[PDB]
Design a binder for this molecule. Structure first.
Ligand SMILES: CC(=O)N[C@H]1[C@H](O[C@@H]2[C@H](O[C@]3(C(=O)O)C[C@H](O)[C@@H](NC(C)=O)[C@H]([C@H](O)[C@H](O)CO)O3)[C@@H](O)[C@H](O[C@H]3[C@H](O)[C@@H](O)[C@H](O)O[C@@H]3CO)O[C@@H]2CO)O[C@H](CO)[C@H](O)[C@@H]1O[C@@H]1O[C@H](CO)[C@H](O)[C@H](O[C@]2(C(=O)O)C[C@H](O)[C@@H](NC(C)=O)[C@H]([C@H](O)[C@H](O)CO)O2)[C@H]1O
Ligand SMILES: [Mg+2]
Length: 425
């Protein structure tokens, strides 16, 4: 019931603007890049001209001993690859003037908030994430950041709606920030470093936990499905597959045609740079390509509830994911068929957002027959030492967001420069 955002930076009518009543002025550098499909996604390189300056009206400049405030934004931080990034804190969003104010900085495996008063008393809160982890929720993936400040007690950093760190700030006196917010990599020794950022907001209160969860939901709610990294899922784009129940396995094929089958096998194997990262390999297994069937949209974005076909790439040729639903048993084993020879086999897939918390990249694929009847969500089943891919209505009968729907939840991983792995072939 009360307008609390004092800066709401959004792309509208061909420009990045402040949608708040204050209409703060935006100065964009010549080397800022916007994502072609989602122009709210902004890429800042390690270059002087890759910067955005927001000029705040005097009335909303922070100059206070007592006023509470918060900031929120989404960020996508490429994996750290090189030892030059160790012990190298670099500013990314700066509202410091004359050694007072606030800033967001990054370091190897860290997002850091710093406040500083006009007597050089500082406090930091820090989110630390590991690069020695099989599959990370955070590395090179869109994550939601929220930072809140209550002058009588704590500053708090939340990640994806969850409190990560809080520290006292009650001893800080007057904080007098800048009338400019500078979005720019400052002090970064890795010449190849960049970030992606979106939906920057400032608020004139300490947001509460409910408000933050609502913001997280509202800014991630979409009728558009997303890939593993959090970008829009697309038609006609090759993806490697991740199953959420068995994330250390990958999809392979045991022969094409109706007597062959798709299956999961593992482990993935590792990608590494000593002392810098150790992760599971993501570019493994047969690539899938999502093909238009029913959608009347002319763009190539995959939307929630779109009915599609799934192609499987085998030896640089596309096959159709399909099954004969008449086979005995609820689990219908999936095959990779020659496209011209699919005939009346079941092949139409409803792409469904799991509608879990956060980004709409947890995908379910409901296979339907040619009369539109459900054959079931695509998952896997042990026969009995091989984990074959199946469509099964058993999944459709399970409790939502429970253990028994992990097996039919998938993510789609395209090659991305922020991950840096080299495919084996
Ligand atoms: C065989 C089996 O265990 N499940 C298969 C099921 O078999 C039936 C009975 O199993 C259920 C059921 O009725 O569906 C499973 C339900 O979840 C239970 N409900 C609840 C609320 O818990 C239900 C109850 O326990 C019933 O009241 C029990 O009757 O049971 C199964 O117990 C029963 O087995 C008989 C047995 O045949 C007899 O010999 C014996 O005398 O008595 C027992 C008990 O009666 O058989 C029932 C019919 O055969 O049948 C369905 C089809 O209807 C499925 O095949 C089901 O297997 C599941 O298949 C789906 C795909 O359809 C997936 O492949 C599941 O795999 C995963 C998954 O969850 O995705 C993969 C995971 O890797 C695996 N995890 C681990 C750690 O290994 C999980 C795991 O089983 C759990 O789901 C953990 O989340 O499974 C696959 O399990
Ligand atoms: Mg939601």
């Amino acid at each position: 019931h009360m307008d609390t955002s004092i800066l709401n930076l959004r792309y509208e009518s061909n420009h990045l603007i402040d949608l708040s009543r204050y209409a703060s002025k935006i100065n964009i550098g010549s080397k800022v890049n916007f994502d072609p499909i989602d122009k709210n996604q902004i890429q800042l390189f390690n270059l002087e001209s890759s910067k955005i300056e927001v000029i705040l009206k005097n009335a909303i400049v922070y100059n206070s001993m007592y006023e509470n405030f918060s900031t929120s934004f989404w960020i996508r931080i490429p994996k750290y690859f090189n030892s030059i990034s160790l012990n190298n804190e670099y500013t990314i969003i700066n509202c410091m003037e004359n050694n007072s104010g606030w800033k967001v900085s990054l370091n190897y495996g860290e997002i850091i908030w710093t406040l500083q008063d006009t007597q050089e008393i500082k406090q930091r809160v820090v989110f630390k994430y590991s690069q020695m982890i099989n599959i990370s929720d955070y590395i090179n993936r869109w994550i939601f950041v929220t930072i809140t400040n209550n002058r009588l007690n704590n500053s708090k950093i939340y990640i994806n709606g969850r409190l990560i760190d809080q520290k006292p700030i009650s001893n800080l006196g007057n904080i007098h920030a800048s009338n400019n917010i500078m979005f720019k990599l400052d002090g970064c020794r890795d010449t190849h470093r960049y970030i992606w950022i979106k939906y920057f907001n400032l608020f004139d209160k300490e947001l509460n936990e409910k408000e933050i969860k609502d913001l997280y939901d509202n800014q991630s709610n979409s009728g558009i499905l997303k890939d593993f990294w959090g970008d829009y899922l697309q038609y006609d784009k090759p993806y490697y597959m991740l199953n959420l129940y068995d994330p250390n396995k990958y999809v392979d094929v045991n022969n094409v045609g109706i007597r062959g089958y798709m299956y999961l096998k593992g482990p993935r194997g590792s990608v590494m740079t000593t002392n810098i990262y150790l992760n599971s390999s993501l570019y493994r297994g047969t690539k899938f390509i999502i093909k238009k069937y029913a959608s009347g949209n002319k763009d190539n974005i995959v939307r929630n509830n779109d009915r599609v076909y799934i192609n499987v790439v085998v030896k640089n040729k596309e096959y159709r994911l399909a099954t004969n639903a008449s086979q005995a048993g609820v689990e219908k084993i999936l095959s990779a068929l020659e496209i011209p020879d699919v005939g009346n086999l079941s092949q139409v897939v409803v792409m469904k957002s799991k509608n879990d918390q956060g980004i709409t990249n947890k995908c379910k694929m409901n296979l339907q027959d040619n009369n539109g009847n459900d054959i079931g969500f695509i998952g896997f089943h042990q026969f009995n030492n091989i984990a074959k891919l199946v469509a099964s209505n058993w999944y459709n009968r399970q409790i939502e967001r429970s253990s028994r729907t992990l097996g039919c939840s998938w993510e789609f991983i395209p090659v991305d420069d922020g991950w840096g792995e080299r495919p084996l072939q």
